[PDB]
C-alpha cells in the first residue's frame, strides 16, 4: 500500500497532502476554513516537511497550526501533538505579551496576535493509500 493520492487543488508530500489558501483571514478564521476543506492547519515535525512548505508558501506571510491554550503556556499543535522540531526566527518565541504562530516567506516561525489579518494559510490532511 502506497500513500500518494491527494485531492484537487491540493499538493502531495510524503504521507500527507497540503493546501495553500489565499485570502484575508484571522488565525481562528483560517482554522475554520481548514475544517471546511476536510483538513486542519499545518503541523511541522521534520526539517524535510518545512523545506517543502517554504517552496510553496506565500512571500508575504502564512498562518500555521501552532498555538497555546493560555492555560498551558507552552505551544501545542492543532492535532494535539507537542513540539519536537522547532524553526523559530531570531528572538522568537517572543514574550512581548507573556498568542499565535505564523510562517514568514523565509520559512521561519514568529509569534503574532490572533486578531492579525493575513492573506495566506496552510491546510494539511493524511494522504489516501492505493492498493
Amino acid at each position: 500500500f502506497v500513500c500518494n493520492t491527494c485531492p484537487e487543488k491540493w499538493i502531495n508530500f510524503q504521507r500527507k497532502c497540503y493546501y495553500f489558501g489565499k485570502g484575508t483571514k484571522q488565525w481562528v478564521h483560517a482554522r475554520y476554513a481548514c475544517d471546511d476543506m476536510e483538513g486542519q492547519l499545518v503541523s511541522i515535525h521534520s526539517p524535510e516537511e518545512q523545506d517543502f512548505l517554504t517552496k510553496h508558501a506565500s512571500h508575504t506571510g502564512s498562518w500555521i497550526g501552532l498555538r497555546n491554550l493560555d492555560l498551558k503556556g507552552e505551544f501545542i499543535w492543532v492535532d494535539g501533538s507537542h513540539v519536537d522540531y522547532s524553526n523559530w526566527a531570531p528572538g522568537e518565541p517572543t514574550s512581548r505579551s507573556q498568542d499565535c504562530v505564523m510562517m514568514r516567506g523565509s520559512g521561519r516561525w514568529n509569534d503574532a496576535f490572533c486578531d492579525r489579518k493575513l492573506g495566506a494559510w496552510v491546510c494539511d490532511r493524511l494522504a489516501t493509500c492505493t492498493p
Binding site: 484571522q26 488565525w27 481562528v28 478564521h29 482554522r31 475554520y32 498555538r67 491554550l69 493560555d70 492555560l71 503556556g73 512581548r96 505579551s97 507573556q98 499565535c100 496576535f113 490572533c114 486578531d115
Partner: protein, 211 residues
C-alpha cells in the same frame, strides 16, 4: 429610548468551569407592544449554540431582556468575534454589538487581602477588603472563600477595572463577615482568576480577623 450592551465571559467560567457564556443586555426605557428580538451570529458565519432569553420588568417601569449565549472555550481564546443584532419595531436603526478576546500584552495580578479592626457599635460584624492590582487585560474574576468552599457572589462587591499609574489595572473587593464565620474558622481566602495568572489561572491570599 433604548440601549444595548454585550459582555465578555468571566475568567472563572472560561478557565476554571470550562463553560464560557457571553450575555447581550438590552435596556428598553419605554416598553411597548411586540418583542425586541435578539439575533445571534459569528464573524465566521458558523452556527451558534442555543441562547437563553430572560425578560424582567423593573420597578422603575422599564423592560430588561438578557440573552445568554454559550461559547466554545478554544473558540473564544483563539479570537472568534460574536455579533448581536437587536431589532425593536419602534426603532429606525437595528442596534449591532460585537465582542471578541482582548488581544494584547499580559500581566499576572498582585493580590493583597486586609481585615478592618473592631469599630464602636460593630462587634458581631467586620469588613474584609482585597486589592487585586497590576494585570492586563481588564477582565478578571474575584472570589471569596471560607472553609475551602466558595461564598455567594451577592455577599461581596467588586469594583470596575480602573487603570493604574503604570500599565496594569486595579480592582477592589469588599466582603462583610459575621461573628459566627470567624469563630468557626479564622481564615478567609481571596481568589483571583486571570488570563496571565500562573500556575493554572489562580492567584490567592489568606486573611484573618484578629490573628
Amino acid at each position: 429610548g433604548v440601549s444595548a450592551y454585550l459582555s465578555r465571559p468571566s475568567p472563572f467560567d472560561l478557565f476554571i468551569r470550562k463553560s464560557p457564556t457571553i450575555t447581550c443586555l438590552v435596556v428598553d426605557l419605554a416598553p411597548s407592544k411586540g418583542t425586541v428580538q435578539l439575533t445571534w451570529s459569528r464573524a465566521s458565519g458558523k452556527p451558534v449554540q442555543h441562547s437563553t432569553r430572560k425578560e424582567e420588568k423593573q420597578r422603575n417601569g422599564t423592560l430588561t431582556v438578557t440573552s445568554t449565549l454559550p461559547v466554545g472555550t478554544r473558540d473564544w481564546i483563539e479570537g472568534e468575534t460574536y455579533q448581536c443584532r437587536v431589532t425593536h419595531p419602534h426603532l429606525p436603526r437595528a442596534l449591532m454589538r460585537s465582542t471578541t478576546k482582548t488581544s494584547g500584552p499580559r500581566a499576572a495580578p498582585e493580590v493583597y487581602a486586609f481585615a478592618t479592626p473592631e469599630w464602636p457599635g460593630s462587634r458581631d460584624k467586620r469588613t474584609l477588603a482585597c486589592l487585586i492590582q497590576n494585570f492586563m487585560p481588564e477582565d478578571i474574576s474575584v472570589q471569596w472563600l471560607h472553609n475551602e468552599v466558595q461564598l455567594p457572589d451577592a455577599r461581596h462587591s467588586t469594583t470596575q477595572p480602573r487603570k493604574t499609574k503604570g500599565s496594569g489595572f486595579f480592582v477592589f473587593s469588599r466582603l462583610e463577615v459575621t461573628r459566627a464565620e470567624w469563630e468557626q474558622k479564622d481564615e478567609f481566602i481571596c481568589r483571583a482568576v486571570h488570563e496571565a495568572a500562573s500556575p493554572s489561572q489562580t492567584v490567592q491570599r489568606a486573611v484573618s480577623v484578629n490573628p
